[PDB]
């Protein structure tokens, strides 16, 4: 029952530390690791983790390429990236490319832990500061409309499941289907869209 996390990076000491941090929280767990983008895309697709942690600082300068390719697959979880830096343009680019959030490698262990846990097993809404960025870039089953409404509120898969009295597996199936259906690449984008048009 703990939330699953897929780690994609090629930065040993960072992964070593992140693993230690994840051990401090029983309700979250690492389901897979990958030091190669291609391998990571394979694991992402077959495991469909609640959280995919991607490092954009990977060798070959193809971190943003792996993101495009992940966003091509049918995923129902969240993708949080380790930004190159805290510069506005490095951040907005990641979000525009399909990431739900971003983290910095120089965060304090205590704060990083809270961020990973929130992204994997908690509520997570985009800050108003970054909302216009996604807004700039921007046939539904009754059950899917219910799921979309809750997604707009930032609820994770598990909370949505225990709310609509459905199994988490069917939630994931519904999320990836209506997402790929409505031409939406991420959950934050789905949330921003809904609020933009005030569907609810
Ligand atoms: Pt710790
Ligand atoms: Pt601890
Ligand atoms: Pt701790
Ligand atoms: Pt919750
Ligand atoms: Pt919860």
Domain boundaries, the chain: 1-124, 125-200
Q: Spell out the long-range contacts of 60-64 with Cβ–Cβ below 8 A and sequence spacing 24 or more.
A: 62/37, 63/37, 64/93, 64/94, 64/97
**CATH architecture designation of domain 1-124:** 3-Layer(aba) Sandwich (3.40)
Question: Token digits for 175?
Answer: 């999320």
Instruction: Give the strands of the sheet with 78-82, arranged side by side.
Output: 28-34, 3-8, 51-55, 78-82, 101-103
Nearest ligand, CA 110: 3
CA–centroid distance, 20 to ligand 2, in Å, is 9
Q: Is the sign of the CA dihedral 32, 37, 38, 42 positive or negative?
A: positive
139: how many CB neighbours lie within 10 A of its CB? 6
Distance CA(178)–CA(138), nearest Å, equals: 17
For the four alpha carbons of 26, 32, 35 and 40, in that order, the dihedral sign comes to negative
**CA–centroid distance, residue 156 to ligand 5 (Å):** 7
**DSSP 8-state code for residue 2:** P
CATH code that applies to domain 125-200: 1.10.10.10
**Tokens 């707009």 map to which residue?**
152
User: Quick one: which ligand is closest to 158's CA?
Assistant: 5
Please identify every residue whose CB atom is under 5 Å from ligand 1, which is an ion: 24
């Amino acid at each position: 029952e703990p939330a699953t996390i897929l780690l994609i990076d090629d930065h040993p000491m960072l992964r070593t530390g992140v693993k230690q941090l994840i051990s401090m929280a029983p309700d979250i767990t690492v389901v897979g690791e990958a030091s190669n983008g291609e391998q990571g895309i394979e694991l992402a697709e077959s495991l469909d983790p609640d959280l995919i942690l991607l490092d954009l600082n990977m060798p070959g300068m193809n971190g943003l390429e792996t993101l495009d390719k992940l966003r091509e697959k049918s995923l129902s979880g969240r993708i949080v990236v380790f930004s190159v830096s805290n510069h506005e343009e490095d951040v907005v680019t990641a979000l525009k490319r399909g990431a739900d959030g971003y983290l910095l490698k120089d965060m304090e262990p205590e704060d990083l832990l809270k961020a990973l846990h929130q992204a994997a097993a908690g509520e997570m809404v985009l800050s108003e500061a970054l909302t216009p960025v996604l807004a700039a870039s921007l046939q539904l089953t009754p059950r899917e409309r219910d799921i979309l409404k809750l997604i707009a509120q930032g609820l994770p898969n598990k909370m949505i499941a225990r709310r609509l009295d459905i199994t988490e597996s069917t939630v994931k199936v519904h999320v990836k289907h209506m997402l790929k259906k409505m031409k939406l690449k991420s959950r934050v984008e789905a949330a921003v869209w809904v609020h933009q048009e005030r569907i609810f």
